[PDB]
Amino acid sequence: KKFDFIIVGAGTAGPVIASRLTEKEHINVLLLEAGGENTNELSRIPGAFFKVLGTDYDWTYSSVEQTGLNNRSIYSPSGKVVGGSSAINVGVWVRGTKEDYDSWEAQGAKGWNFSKALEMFQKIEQTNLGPSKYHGDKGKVKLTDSSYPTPFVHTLLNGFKEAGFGEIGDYAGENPYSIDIMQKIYENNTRRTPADSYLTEDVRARENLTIITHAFVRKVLFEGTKAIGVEVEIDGQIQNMYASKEIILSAGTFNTPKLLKLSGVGPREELEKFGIPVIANVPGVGENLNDHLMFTLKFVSEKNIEDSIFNPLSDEAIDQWYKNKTGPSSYYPGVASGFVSSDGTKTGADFELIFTYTHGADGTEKEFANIEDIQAQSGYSVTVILLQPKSRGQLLLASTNPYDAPLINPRYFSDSSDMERFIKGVRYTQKITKTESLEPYTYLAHPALDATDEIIESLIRNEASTVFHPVGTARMGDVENDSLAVVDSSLKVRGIQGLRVADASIIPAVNRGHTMAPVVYVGEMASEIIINDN
Ligand SMILES: Cc1cc2nc3c(=O)[nH]c(=O)nc-3n(C[C@H](O)[C@H](O)[C@H](O)COP(=O)(O)OP(=O)(O)OC[C@H]3O[C@@H](n4cnc5c(N)ncnc54)[C@H](O)[C@@H]3O)c2cc1C
Numbered sequence: 001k002k003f004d005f006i007i008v009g010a011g012t013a014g015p016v017i018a019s020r021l022t023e024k025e026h027i028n029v030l031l032l033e034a035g036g037e038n039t040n041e042l043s044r045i046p047g048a049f050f051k052v053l054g055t056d057y058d059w060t061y062s063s064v065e066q067t068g069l070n071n072r073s074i075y076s077p078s079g080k081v082v083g084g085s086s087a088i089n090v091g092v093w094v095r096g097t098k099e100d101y102d103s104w105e106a107q108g109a110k111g112w113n114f115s116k117a118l119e120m121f122q123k124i125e126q127t128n129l130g131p132s133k134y135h136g137d138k139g140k141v142k143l144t145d146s147s148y149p150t151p152f153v154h155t156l157l158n159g160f161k162e163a164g165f166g167e168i169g170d171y172a173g174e175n176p177y178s179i180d181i182m183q184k185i186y187e188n189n190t191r192r193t194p195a196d197s198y199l200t201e202d203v204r205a206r207e208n209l210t211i212i213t214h215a216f217v218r219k220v221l222f223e224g225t226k227a228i229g230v231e232v233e234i235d236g237q238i239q240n241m242y243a244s245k246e247i248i249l250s251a252g253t254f255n256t257p258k259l260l261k262l263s264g265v266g267p268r269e270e271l272e273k274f275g276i277p278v279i280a281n282v283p284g285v286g287e288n289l290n291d292h293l294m295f296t297l298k299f300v301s302e303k304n305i306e307d308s309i310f311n312p313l314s315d316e317a318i319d320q321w322y323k324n325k326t327g328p329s330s331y332y333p334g335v336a337s338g339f340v341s342s343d344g345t346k347t348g349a350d351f352e353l354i355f356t357y358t359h360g361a362d363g364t365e366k367e368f369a370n371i372e373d374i375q376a377q378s379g380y381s382v383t384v385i386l387l388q389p390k391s392r393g394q395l396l397l398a399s400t401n402p403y404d405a406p407l408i409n410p411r412y413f414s415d416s417s418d419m420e421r422f423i424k425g426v427r428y429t430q431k432i433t434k435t436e437s438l439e440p441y442t443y444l445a446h447p448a449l450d451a452t453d454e455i456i457e458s459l460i461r462n463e464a465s466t467v468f469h470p471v472g473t474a475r476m477g478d479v480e481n482d483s484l485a486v487v488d489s490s491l492k493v494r495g496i497q498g499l500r501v502a503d504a505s506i507i508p509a510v511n512r513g514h515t516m517a518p519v520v521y522v523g524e525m526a527s528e529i530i531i532n533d534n
Helices: 013-021 098-106 114-124 152-162 194-198 252-262 268-273 315-324 416-434 453-463 516-533
Strands: 003-008 029-032 178-181 209-212 215-223 226-234 237-249 293-300 334-340 351-356 379-386 394-396 407-409 444-446 499-501
Touching: 003 013, 003 226, 013 029, 013 194, 013 516, 029 237, 098 114, 098 516, 114 516, 152 178, 152 334, 152 351, 194 516, 215 237, 215 252, 237 252, 237 516, 252 394, 293 416, 293 453, 351 416, 379 416, 416 453
Parallel strands: 003 029, 003 237, 029 209, 237 499
Antiparallel strands: 178 334, 215 226, 226 237, 293 379, 293 444, 334 351, 351 379, 394 407
16 A cells, blocks of 8 residues: 555554545555554543553553652653553543634744634534534533532632632633633543544545554654654564555654654754764754643531542442443532632732542641541642643653653753742642531541641642643744754644644643643644645
8 A cells, every 4th residue: 555644652642643645546555553453341430540541541641750849750651552642541631722822923933823723623522512613512522411420510710710710611712710620532432532523434434544553653753854764663563564655653752752762853963962963953853742730629528528539440339330331330420610810910810729529538638637537528629730830841862762761851950940830839729628518528638727838838849740641842833943843834844845843742732721622623623734744
């Protein structure tokens, strides 16, 4: 078979592009994926999916020790399956704000703005929040409200409003400073990924689309500065596969920059250190790594929270789910999210608050030391996320061995403003415990409501963790005027012909939200851009 395009990675973005490009009969596309098809049904259960973390569905990377996080190494999973990380995530669709999408253009990516995003979300989203200017009703990706067992969700929503944080309603709509029930990529309590949605039976039956799983790409092949193919391992043997038009990397934030560097596209000094011939000196490759951190405030209640205590991992729950897609396994505790402006300026949300109707305590919290049967007690939690960290890190090669994990270093809290703002965000959030709604349910707190800045800082450095939103290691921008931009507005890699990147790696900075939705946007955008070239 003769291919026009090879797409590396059938994750979140890659599948979109394979689906769109093969709408033209004459365009042959090869889609390569290191993992298998998404056949482990446990991964599709909203309340139990996380049991597949650490398995063959996961690359199981961790960060280098983080000096800003008390030298902790941060477990940094990513999907290894058709669906990529969208196959192993909570599945919340929290796309961000106007300023997020507009900022890409402002930093040199002409044509990438909120107006285009809205146009793409009409094609992407299938939600009962639509039809509207903000939401599609008939797009490819079905979105449903999180399922929950407890009426206490209403008390959380009311508490946010009572605290003065903002309104109850659609944070992805007209008023961003709102709290809502999060929608998720589930249909009938079963995960349906973008890949499921774009690579349907019909699409896969197209003669001009070839999908190979268990295909591990080791490097991109060149003739001069022109990308012509990939070296790929299929079932313990190596093949070279070729494209007559272009190679598209959709291997995600961690593996895309690794592949680029191994292939001779990256910072000259690092490549030369490893003896890798430099085909294009692109300093930006592997730079600008950024990610969100979350810190959870936990609250134990004396007052019962009805039907809040259940076990989504029990054999009875899981069976009930297999049988008729109901029961405890339907429920993920993180159900609502609100966006706030902690300094009142409303110039873009600065914090996200994610709410559960359980304390989420492990029992080793000092403030809960003397509580009996903590797990049987009622409570709630608010996870605070600093939405626009200034810290930037690196994705480096460990070696020239294609199988070796890349070295992931977000440099969390390396920019001093991050901790400064985070401490303020925690204190802002803690006001919610004073509301008429939530004061009745706030008996003990972690951190304590009277904790010093020093105690809060220490707890953040020891307990804050990735929200799984790495971006930025092949940043899209103005490659004429910005030495650290990697790809242009057309997603073409600088210094190279016939090579594009389309995945989270091109996203300049994390959004006010979660990264699955902007990644699907990138896939729809890449598709339109490529089709309009040809
Ligand atoms: C545990 C977890 C929870 C998350 N929760 C949410 C959430 O609820 N909502 C949200 O919006 N975001 C969430 N995210 C983030 C979001 O899922 C990702 O940002 C997004 O899916 C990344 O899309 P992508 O296409 O860039 O990469 P991926 O989805 O990681 O796709 C990359 C693909 O390339 C394949 N691949 C990589 N290297 C090679 C190679 N060399 N050869 C062949 N194939 C290769 C991978 O196997 C994979 O399928 C979560 C992430 C994780 C890990």
